[PDB]
Amino acid sequence: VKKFPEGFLWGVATASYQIEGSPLADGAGMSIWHTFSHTPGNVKNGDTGDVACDHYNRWKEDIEIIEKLGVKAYRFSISWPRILPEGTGRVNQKGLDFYNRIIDTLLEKGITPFVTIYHWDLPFALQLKGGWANREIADWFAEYSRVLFENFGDRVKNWITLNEPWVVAIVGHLYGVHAPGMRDIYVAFRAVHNLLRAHARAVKVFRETVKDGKIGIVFNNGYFEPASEKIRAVRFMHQFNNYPLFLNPIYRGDYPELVLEFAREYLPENYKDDMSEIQEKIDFVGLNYYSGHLVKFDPAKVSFVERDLPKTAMGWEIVPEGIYWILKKVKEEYNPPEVYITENGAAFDDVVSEDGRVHDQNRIDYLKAHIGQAWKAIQEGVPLKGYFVWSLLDNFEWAEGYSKRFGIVYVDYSTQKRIVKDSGYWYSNVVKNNGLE
Numbered sequence: 407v408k409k410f411p412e413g414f415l416w417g418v419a420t421a422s423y424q425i426e427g428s429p430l431a432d433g434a435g436m437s438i439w440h441t442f443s444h445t446p447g448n449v450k451n452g453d454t455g456d457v458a459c460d461h462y463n464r465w466k467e468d469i470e471i472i473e474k475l476g477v478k479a480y481r482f483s484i485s486w487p488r489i490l491p492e493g494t495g496r497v498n499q500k501g502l503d504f505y506n507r508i509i510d511t512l513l514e515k516g517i518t519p520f521v522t523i524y525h526w527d528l529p530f531a532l533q534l535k536g537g538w539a540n541r542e543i544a545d546w547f548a549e550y551s552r553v554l555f556e557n558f559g560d561r562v563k564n565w566i567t568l569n570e571p572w573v574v575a576i577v578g579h580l581y582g583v584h585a586p587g588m589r590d591i592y593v594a595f596r597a598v599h600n601l602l603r604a605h606a607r608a609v610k611v612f613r614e615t616v617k618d619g620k621i622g623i624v625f626n627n628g629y630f631e632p633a634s635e636k637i638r639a640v641r642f643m644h645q646f647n648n649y650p651l652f653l654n655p656i657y658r659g660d661y662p663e664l665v666l667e668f669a670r671e672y673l674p675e676n677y678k679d680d681m682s683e684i685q686e687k688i689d690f691v692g693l694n695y696y697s698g699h700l701v702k703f704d705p706a707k708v709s710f711v712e713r714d715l716p717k718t719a720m721g722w723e724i725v726p727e728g729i730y731w732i733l734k735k736v737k738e739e740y741n742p743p744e745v746y747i748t749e750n751g752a753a754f755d756d757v758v759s760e761d762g763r764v765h766d767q768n769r770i771d772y773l774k775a776h777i778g779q780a781w782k783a784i785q786e787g788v789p790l791k792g793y794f795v796w797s798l799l800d801n802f803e804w805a806e807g808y809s810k811r812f813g814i815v816y817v818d819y820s821t822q823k824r825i826v827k828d829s830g831y832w833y834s835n836v837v838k839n840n841g842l843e
């Protein structure tokens with residue numbers, strides 16, 4: 407058997423825009439994902455988050471699913487423009503009420519809330535003022551975070567400032583594939599820097615407002631392996647695409663060496679002036695992990711090399727040892743006091759069989775392998791306190807729309823029916839047993 411530490415936090419994760427629907431209900435302002443998805447050409451099939459999983463109405467049912475599965479923690483995000491419709495200034499009580507009911511329900515049912523303050527749904531009003539490109543967002547984000555802390559910090563004790571600031575900056579402002587859909591490398595690196603400044607300011611406010619409780623930050627990570635033994639390209643991909651881009655500032659007070667080699671000219675001229683503030687002490691690091699990649703130098707002087715490995719419906723290579731590597735590596739490089747796996751999961755072409763069940767053995771095999779590697783990292787000293795499956799529900803998968811299903815629960819979008827998949831049932835047994843057998 408593979409048993410986890412006593413009180414290890416087994417969880418599931420979601421994000422507001424991906425599951426809620428009703429983006430403009432009850433006085434909410436538009437987000438940048440509302441306007442981006444309503445722009446033709448940006449999202450597969452013209453899909454939007456207008457309805458999604460209708461969690462805005464079905465939240466109680468969904469939480470009852472978490473309870474019934476015996477899952478111990480729920481990672482969810484708060485929609486900034488539901489709380490402050492113009493981004494700063496006015497606070498919307500109906501937006502607070504929505505999350506208040508979720509928080510109280512979770513606590514009543516003995517489920518630990520983990521709140522992501524920002525999972526990509528920036529208020530549109532702030533994007534008109536440059537969004538993450540504007541230095542003033544450190545102030546706007548701090549004011550937003552302070553409202554959440556004042557309203558919920560009595561009950562919610564586990565907070566995450568940002569989900570995947572690399573994705574927000576680079577996919578949103580360089581690749582242009584995510585909101586706000588820009589392609590400018592100078593803007594993208596100023597977003598990187600302002601995301602760090604905003605994170606640190608929010609942590610600073612947290613220490614002033616919520617006497618009890620812990621705050622951290624979540625990074626996307628890939629497992630990069632070299633295509634040959636000629637290695638530096640892997641080095642750069644790790645430092646740029648993984649936690650070091652942000653953790654080197656936080657722990658060491660500067661960007662990683664190979665990031666500066668690539669991107670110095672794109673960063674603000676006096677960016678180091680902000681570094682002492684960026685070193686604000688954090689309580690844990692959240693790592694998201696899904697895929698491994700074979701990488702070679704290619705005259706960012708990096709290209710991916712396709713491997714003949716099992717892949718998910720995203721085309722992502724399944725490399726379970728990657729989750730072990732990233733956990734070992736984070737300890738070795740920055741030694742954070744606590745780590746969580748804040749997302750791990752897979753998209754497959756799920757079908758409801760004639761027997762009414764969703765037989766996703768492929769997803770079971772994926773989760774089991776990665777949970778096994780996480781267990782290993784714990785045996786070797788990594789202070790992993792929890793593990794969150796992405797996602798509770800099939801949902802709006804950003805620019806892929808509804809075409810990619812990551813849930814351990816199937817959603818029939820025609821009826822909003824939830825069908826617990828085989829992977830959901832399997833996971834519930836893992837949680838009940840506190841591990842694998």
Ligand SMILES: O=C(O)Cc1c[n+]2c([nH]1)[C@H](O)[C@@H](O)[C@H](O)[C@H]2CO
Binds near residue numbers: 627
């Ligand atoms: O970017 C990565 O490699 C890691 C990643 C996967 N995912 C995420 N990050 C986001 O946090 C989620 O909102 C997505 O739904 C999910 C699946 O794509």
